[PDB]
Amino acid sequence: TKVKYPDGFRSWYHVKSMVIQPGHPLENPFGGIHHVYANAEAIQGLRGGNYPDGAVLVFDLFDYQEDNHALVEGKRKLIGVMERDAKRFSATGGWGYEGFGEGKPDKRLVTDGGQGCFGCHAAQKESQYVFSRLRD
Amino acid sequence: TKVKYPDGFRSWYHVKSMVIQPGHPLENPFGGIHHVYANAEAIQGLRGGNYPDGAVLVFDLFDYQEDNHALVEGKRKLIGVMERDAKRFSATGGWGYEGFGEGKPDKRLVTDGGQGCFGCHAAQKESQYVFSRLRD
Numbered sequence: 001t002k003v004k005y006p007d008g009f010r011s012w013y014h015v016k017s018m019v020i021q022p023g024h025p026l027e028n029p030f031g032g033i034h035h036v037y038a039n040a041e042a043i044q045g046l047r048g049g050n051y052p053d054g055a056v057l058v059f060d061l062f063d064y065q066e067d068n069h070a071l072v073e074g075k076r077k078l079i080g081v082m083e084r085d086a087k088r089f090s091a092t093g094g095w096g097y098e099g100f101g102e103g104k105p106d107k108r109l110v111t112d113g114g115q116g117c118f119g120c121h122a123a124q125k126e127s128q129y130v131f132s133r134l135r136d
Numbered sequence: 137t138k139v140k141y142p143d144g145f146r147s148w149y150h151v152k153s154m155v156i157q158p159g160h161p162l163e164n165p166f167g168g169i170h171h172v173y174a175n176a177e178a179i180q181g182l183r184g185g186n187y188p189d190g191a192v193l194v195f196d197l198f199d200y201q202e203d204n205h206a207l208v209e210g211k212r213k214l215i216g217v218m219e220r221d222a223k224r225f226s227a228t229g230g231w232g233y234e235g236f237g238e239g240k241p242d243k244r245l246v247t248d249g250g251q252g253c254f255g256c257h258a259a260q261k262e263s264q265y266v267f268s269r270l271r272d
């Protein structure tokens with residue numbers, strides 16, 4: 001019961017983006033420009049429906065470079081993945097959590113069954129462990 | 137001929153993003169966090185093919201707020217649109233250029249037939265006048 005690498009995630013629905021800069025509490029390890037993506041099943045859940053099993057959310061994290069009052073996307077640091085399965089991932093609230101170093105399928109990062117990821121996302125119990133909100 | 141409003145662009149392919157902060161040359165009016173989206177026809181040109189008629193690129197521009205060293209997306213300021221049609225938009229190199237204030241269909245920003253946008257995009261004549269490049 002590993003989380004699947006979310007192949008083709010780059011062509012999913014772009015939910016939102018955020019920049020975390022030096023100084024911010026999450027600078028380590030979430031510093032950079034991040035983009036959130038969702039497959040069709042996650043949109044149902046994001047829209048106010050419930051999350052079908054098979055819903056995947058992706059946090060895509062880039063380093064950035066300062067270029068004359070512009071922040072420009074550099075190298076991918078990692079992707080974080082949440083994969084909905086109420087039964088398979090019941091231990092961390094129905095979502096499996098995984099990280100892939102630099103987005104690579106072979107650089108699995110999570111060593112504790114997702115407990116560490118889950119400890120922070122649990123703050124969002126009432127929105128089903130998802131921080132991002134859909135926007136227009 | 138008017139550039140058509142690109143309905144549904146938000147569910148298109150996310151090409152890339154960039155932040156333009158106060159002091160950048162493009163600050164006025166392109167300051168903020170922007171995301172580039174491309175329809176299926178535009179992806180063909182991005183991938184090295186010719187841009188077919190009906191290709192559409194969108195520049196989606198948000199204001200942002202700086203909050204404890206995070207940049208957080210606020211309100212949409214505008215979208216910029218490029219619509220491909222070699223015949224109808226030959227005057228501006230085969231792309232029609234339009235701005236929609238706040239992303240609303242009824243707030244057209246361009247008043248000079250697109251020559252102002254074309255004047256700068258012509259620098260990238262070699263790339264069919266598109267600055268953005270597909271990244272992974």
Ligand code: HEC
Nearest residue numbers: 018036057058059080081082097098099117120130131132
């Ligand atoms: C707090 C200390 C966190 C830890 C540890 C982890 N995550 Fe997280 N995550 C956090 C915030 C504040 C957000 C919202 C970001 C935004 O732009 O709003 C997120 C987001 C995600 C997402 C996108 C879906 C969502 O919940 O908004 C995914 C797919 C995600 N996170 C996965 C993830 C994994 C796999 C983690 C451990 C390796 C992990 N997160 C840790 C806060 C925190």
Ligand code: HEC
Nearest residue numbers: 154172193194195216217218233234235253256266267268
């Ligand atoms: C230089 C002074 C510019 C003027 C005037 C206009 N644009 Fe532009 N545009 C510019 C750059 C450097 C970029 C790339 C930004 C990035 O993230 O790399 C853009 C981008 C676009 C896009 C996205 C597709 C692409 O070419 O990368 C669109 C749809 C776009 N611009 C439209 C547009 C319109 C409608 C303009 C006049 C209202 C316009 N642009 C002006 C540089 C400049």
Ligand SMILES: [Zn+2]
Nearest residue numbers: 021022023205
């Ligand atoms: Zn900083």
Ligand SMILES: [Zn+2]
Nearest residue numbers: 068069159160
């Ligand atoms: Zn300066």
